[PDB]
Amino acid sequence: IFKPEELRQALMPTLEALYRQDPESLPFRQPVDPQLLGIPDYFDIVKNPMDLSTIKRKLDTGQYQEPWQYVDDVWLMFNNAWLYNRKTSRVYKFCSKLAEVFEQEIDPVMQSLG
Numbered sequence: 001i002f003k004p005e006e007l008r009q010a011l012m013p014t015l016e017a018l019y020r021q022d023p024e025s026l027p028f029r030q031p032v033d034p035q036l037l038g039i040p041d042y043f044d045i046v047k048n049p050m051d052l053s054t055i056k057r058k059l060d061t062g063q064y065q066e067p068w069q070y071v072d073d074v075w076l077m078f079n080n081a082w083l084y085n086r087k088t089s090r091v092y093k094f095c096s097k098l099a100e101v102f103e104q105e106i107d108p109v110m111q112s113l114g
């Protein structure tokens with residue numbers, strides 16, 4: 001079993017590594033707001049939205065019981081952006097950069113946590 005403060009200690013540096021990507025992480029620091037962005041179909045397409053602020057709060061409150069639930073939420077964030085945004089868009093290419101960064105940062109941590 002994984003204690004929530006052990007998960008936070010291990011996993012939150014990989015999340016801070018994503019925040020440190022600037023400007024690539026800027027679209028991802030807060031939930032998508034389809035009203036502000038004038039994209040009324042966003043919630044038609046993205047049925048399980050996720051973003052860095054939601055993941056951070058879940059680490060902060062101990063809502064992950066297992067490290068793979070965290071990894072899954074980060075990838076859900078990525079997949080939502082790749083699904084909604086065109087492959088030529090800045091948000092799409094920024095998402096791809098974040099996934100490259102995350103894949104590096106998460107590998108030694110998950111090796112440690114197993």
Ligand SMILES: CO[C@H]1CC[C@@H](n2c([C@@H]3CCCC(=O)N3c3ccc(Br)c(Br)c3)nc3cc(-c4c(C)noc4C)ccc32)CC1
Nearest residue numbers: 023024026027028030032037039080081084085090091094
């Ligand atoms: C203060 O909080 C702000 C609120 C919103 C802002 N926002 C912008 C803005 C507005 C439009 C003009 C522009 O050019 N924006 C822009 C700004 C910075 C960068 Br970097 C980039 Br790229 C674009 N578009 C966004 C797209 C997403 C998105 C995702 C993920 N999945 O689907 C979508 C869709 C999410 C947030 C976005 C980011 C931060």
